[PDB]
Every structure is written in C-alpha cells, then in structure tokens.
Amino acid sequence: KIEEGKLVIWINGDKGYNGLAEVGKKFEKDTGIKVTVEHPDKLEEKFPQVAATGDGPDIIFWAHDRFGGYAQSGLLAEITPAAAFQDKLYPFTWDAVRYNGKLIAYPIAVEALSLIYNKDLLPNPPKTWEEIPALDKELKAKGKSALMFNLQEPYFTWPLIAADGGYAFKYAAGKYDIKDVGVDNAGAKAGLTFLVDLIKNKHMNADTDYSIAEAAFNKGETAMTINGPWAWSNIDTSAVNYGVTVLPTFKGQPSKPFVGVLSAGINAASPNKELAKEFLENYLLTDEGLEAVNKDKPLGAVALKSYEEELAKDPRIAATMENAQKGEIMPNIPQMSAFWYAVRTAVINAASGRQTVDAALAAAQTNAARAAAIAEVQAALQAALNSDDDAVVAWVQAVMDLIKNGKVSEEEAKLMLAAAAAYAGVLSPELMKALGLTPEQIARALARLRQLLGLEHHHHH
Numbered sequence: 001k002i003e004e005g006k007l008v009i010w011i012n013g014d015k016g017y018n019g020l021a022e023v024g025k026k027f028e029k030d031t032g033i034k035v036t037v038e039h040p041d042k043l044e045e046k047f048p049q050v051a052a053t054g055d056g057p058d059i060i061f062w063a064h065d066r067f068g069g070y071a072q073s074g075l076l077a078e079i080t081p082a083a084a085f086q087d088k089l090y091p092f093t094w095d096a097v098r099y100n101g102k103l104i105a106y107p108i109a110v111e112a113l114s115l116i117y118n119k120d121l122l123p124n125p126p127k128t129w130e131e132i133p134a135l136d137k138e139l140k141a142k143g144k145s146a147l148m149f150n151l152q153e154p155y156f157t158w159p160l161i162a163a164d165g166g167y168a169f170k171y172a173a174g175k176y177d178i179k180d181v182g183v184d185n186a187g188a189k190a191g192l193t194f195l196v197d198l199i200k201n202k203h204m205n206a207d208t209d210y211s212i213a214e215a216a217f218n219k220g221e222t223a224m225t226i227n228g229p230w231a232w233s234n235i236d237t238s239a240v241n242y243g244v245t246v247l248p249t250f251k252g253q254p255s256k257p258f259v260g261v262l263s264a265g266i267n268a269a270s271p272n273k274e275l276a277k278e279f280l281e282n283y284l285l286t287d288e289g290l291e292a293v294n295k296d297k298p299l300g301a302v303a304l305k306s307y308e309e310e311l312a313k314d315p316r317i318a319a320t321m322e323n324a325q326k327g328e329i330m331p332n333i334p335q336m337s338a339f340w341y342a343v344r345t346a347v348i349n350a351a352s353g354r355q356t357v358d359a360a361l362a363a364a365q366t367n368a369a370r371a372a373a374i375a376e377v378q379a380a381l382q383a384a385l386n387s388d389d390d391a392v393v394a395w396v397q398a399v400m401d402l403i404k405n406g407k408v409s410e411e412e413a414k415l416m417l418a419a420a421a422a423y424a425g426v427l428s429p430e431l432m433k434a435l436g437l438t439p440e441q442i443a444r445a446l447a448r449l450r451q452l453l454g455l456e457h458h459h460h461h
Contacts, residue, residue: 001055004271006034007279010047011061013039015262019296023289027279035279051075054269058276064096064105064261068332071099077266077273078102085281093303096261096329101174105263106280107303108290112324113159113228113257114316115248119241121223122146129160129194129250136203139223148213149226151195151206151351154343156226159247159255161191161347162328166256168339169331176331178372179434183343184358184365191250193357196350206351229300229320244316247323254326261303261329338371370414373435377417380431384424392424399449402456412445419446 002008007024011017017039024035038057040046044066050056052073070076081103086094093107117125121144126132136146150156158166165187170180182188198204217225218238226247235242247255264284266276283289290307293299301321302308312318330336346364349355355363384396399420402408408416414435421427422442432442 001053002058002267002270002272006036007059007272007275008036008038008057009059009061010038010040010043010057012043013041014297015039015061016293016296016299019293020284022292022296023283024279026289026292027283031278033275048073048075051267051269056267056269058267058270058272059280060265060267061108061262062265064107064263065330065332065336067097067105067263067265068099069334070265071104072334075268076104077268077270078104079106079266079277081106081277081281085285088285088305089303090305090308090325092259092325092329093261096259096332097263098174099332105265106285107261107263108285109262109299110301110303110321110324111228111260111262112320112327113156113226113247114244114319114323115224115246116217116227116231116235117224117243117245118217118220118222119243121220125224125243125245126248128252129163129248129255132248133198133201133203135223145216145222146203147224147226148204148208148216148222149224150208150210150213151204152209152344152348154340154347155258156210157192157195157347158343159226159257159323159327160195160250161188161343162256163187163250163253164190166191167328168336169333171331176333176335178333178335178376179369181339181365181369181372183339183346183368184361189357189361192347192350192361194250195347196357199351206353229298229316232316244319246319246326255323257323257327258330259324259327262299335368335372335375338375339368342367342371370410374413374417377414377421377427377431377435380421380426380428381417381424384421384426396420396424398453398457402449402452405456407452407456415441415445416449416452418442419449422446 009020011020017037021037024037028034044062047056047060048070067076089107093110094103097103097105097107115125126135132146139146165185167182169176169178170182199206213225214231214234216222218235218240220240247257264280266273270276285304287307290299290302290304301317301324302311308321312321342364346360350357350360381396384392387393403413415437418427418432418435418437419442423446
C-alpha cells in the first residue's frame with residue numbers, strides 16, 4: 001500500500017512545501033531515494049482514516065496537539081533519536097511530542113503569542129499588566145486606548161489566566177492527568193479577575209473579538225495588541241511602526257501563552273521508517289534544510305537551536321521564542337476539546353457579568369474534568385461495543401440510546417456509564433477509583449439504570 005524505497009510526505013499548504021521538496025531533492029541526489037511532498041486539504045482528518053488501514057504518507061507534518069490522538073490509535077511509529085540529536089533541539093519542544101513515556105514525533109517549529117506595540121504611541125511598552133490601567137488613562141486623554149485584543153477565544157486570554165498558576169491538564173508520571181485540571185485554582189481566578197477588572201474600569205470592552213482588535217491596532221487606534229506571527233503580515237501592510245516583545249508579567253510572574261509545535265510523525269505502517277528518520281534528522285533538521293523551507297514560506301521560530309539563533313536576529317522571532325519558553329506546551333490529548341469549550345464559556349460569562357469569576361471558573365473546571373472522565377468510561381463501553389457477546393452489545397447499545405434520548409443528566413452520566421461498564425464486565429477497579437466512585441454507588445446506580453432502561457424499552461406511554 002505504502003510504496004517501499006521512497007518517501008511520501010504530507011504537509012499543510014500554508015507551509016513551505018516547495019522548500020521541503022528541495023530538501024527532498026537533496027536527499028535524492030545523495031541517496032537515490034525519491035521524495036514526494038503533497039499538501040492535501042484536511043490532511044489532519046485524512047491521515048487517521050487512511051493510516052487506520054495501513055495506507056497514507058510515510059511522514060505527516062501537523063500541529064503537535066493532534067499527535068496524541070494519533071498515537072492512541074496506534075497510527076504512529078515511536079521515534080528513537082539518539083541523545084546527541086535530541087540535544088540539537090530546544091528541550092521543551094520534546095515535551096510537545098511525548099506519549100505514554102515515549103516520543104512520537106520530531107519537533108520542527110514553535111509558535112506562541114507575543115505583545116505587539118505601536119512604537120509611535122508607546123516607545124517603551126509596559127513590563128507588567130498592572131501598569132496598563134494608568135497607561136490607558138493617559139492614552140484615553142488623546143483619543144487612543146492602551147490595549148485591544150481578542151477576548152472571545154480563550155487561547156488569547158489564557159496567558160494572563162495562567163500567569164499566577166492556571167494550567168490545562170497537569171503532566172504526571174508519563175501522561176497527562178485528566179483528573180487534574182487547573183482552571184479554578186487561586187492563580188487562574190486572580191488572572192481572570194484582573195481581566196474582568198480591566199473591563200469594569202472601562203479599559204477594555206467585553207465585546208472585543210479578533211477582527212475588532214486587529215482593525216484597531218492596524219489603524220493606529222490602540223497602542224498594543226496580543227497576537228501571533230500569522231498576524232504580522234497584515235500589520236506590515238498597514239505600515240504601523242510596530243514592535244513584538246515579551247508579554248507583560250502578572251503579579252511578577254510571566255504570562256504563559258500556549259505553545260504550538262509543528263511536528264513530523266512517522267506512519268506506523270511505513271516500510272520506510274529508517275529512511276524517514278535519516279531524512280528528518282540529517283536533512284530537514286539542519287541549518288540548510290530549515291533554511292530551504294523558510295526561504296519558501298517563513299516558519300517563524302524553529303525548534304533547531306543552531307538555526308533559531310540565526311532567525312532570532314529578527315527581534316520578532318526572538319520575542320516569539322522568548323514567550324514560548326515562558327509558555328505552557330498545549331496538552332496533546334483529545335480531552336483538550338472539552339477544555340477549550342469550558343474555558344471559553346467561563347471567560348465570556350465572567351466578562352459579561354452573567355457569573356462571578358469564582359462561579360464561572362468553578363463551572364469550567366467541573367465541565368472540563370467531567371467531560372474527560374465521561375470519555376474514559378465511554379471508551380471502556382466502546383470496547384464493549386465491539387465485543388463478540390451480543391447480550392453485552394445489545395445492552396451497551398441500549399444505554400447509549402437512553403442517553404442520546406436525554407433520559408440521563410450530564411451530572412448522572414458518569415455513574416450511569418460506570419454501572420453499564422460494570423454489568424458489561426469492562427469496568428476495572430482502576431477505572432472505578434479514577435472516576436471517584438465506589439461499588440455501593442455503582443450498584444445503586446445499576447438498579448436505577450435497570451429502571452430507566454425498563455421505562456425506555458418496555459413501557460407504553
């Protein structure tokens with residue numbers, strides 16, 4: 001299915017695919033091994049579909065956050081770079097490509113938000129968030145504002161919320177602990193409280209979204225914004241004299257933006273794994289290889305220390321890496337979906353005054369953790385869905401039916417799914433304790449689930 005003796009590479013069309021093709025031509029000239037670079041749309045969804053049956057590319061390039069899911073499905077070869085090669089990339093970028101105590105991809109490039117400022121309004125940007133109210137006062141007297149950034153998406157507000165102690169999921173003992181969410185601790189509450197106070201004191205508008213903030217900064221109306229390297233081109237077009245710098249501190253702690261790592265994984269079914277390793281380690285992840293890609297389309301900051309030191313002569317790239325080194329590697333697990341939605345709701349609810357900061361973040365903590373736990377026991381039940389016992393299959397089917405008909409509240413779902421998993425013989429004491437449940441609870445829940453299934457299946461309304 002995958003052709004032996006050559007390399008097929010998938011990378012998104014917004015990257016330097018022609019330059020990667022030039023690295024492949026050099027590989028071919030040296031070895032005889034041909035390299036094909038393709039940029040299909042939705043490669044991040046096509047890959048799991050084709051790799052599941054042993055087809056697809058030898059190498060896939062994508063944001064690191066998807067690779068945990070791919071590794072869970074058995075779609076990636078585990079990589080074994082030697083110590084000397086590992087030392088050539090920034091050590092925190094390897095923290096982006098771990099799964100189950102192993103490495104599952106090569107880090108290529110690094111992106112994170114920075115502080116962007118208008119040097120003609122603000123030649124000396126603030127070192128602290130706490131300085132921004134006073135700055136805004138003085139700029140408001142000139143018909144300007146100090147800071148406008150996207151408040152609608154929690155990716156943009158996270159650096160402040162995480163500064164004094166918020167975190168998404170805690171890493172522990174070789175995996176992310178999906179029980180340990182850091183959304184409602186005192187640090188997260190302090191950062192969101194500062195954001196909400198900026199809104200209450202009229203230095204920001206709760207309504208500000210991406211396009212409003214971008215337009216305001218590029219028209220010279222606000223002295224600062226928070227954005228990533230994807231945005232610089234538009235500012236270039238606007239001829240604002242801008243600088244890019246380290247984000248301000250909060251309570252004396254660095255802002256902690258999420259870090260995304262462009263990564264290269266190897267298909268678990270590739271007959272060319274050693275060739276892929278030689279290509280990535282000895283051709284792509286060199287000064288010459290990254291320069292070829294970068295000359296086609298800029299990569300931004302890169303994971304390779306030697307070439308990042310050259311790119312960092314651009315002070316914007318230097319600032320991107322400085323903020324990345326102060327940031328939080330985005331967890332590479334599918335549970336982040338629930339996190340994103342939960343925190344989004346919390347910030348909007350607190351910023352609009354529908355909830356206190358304390359209640360909004362309590363809700364987001366509960367919702368993110370509960371969704372992760374429900375997904376764990378749901379995976380166990382999926383193992384029961386594809387078993388060879390038709391009584392078991394019929395039963396777990398019935399329970400799924402019962403929930404999709406809305407006969408079970410979100411807050412009862414964990415106990416009910418655990419009772420289903422216990423009757424089906426797929427609930428283990430490790431999972432039971434990790435759900436925070438006890439056998440007595442599960443048995444009472446099981447009687448109740450018997451009743452609910454009875455009314456749902458053998459009852460005339």
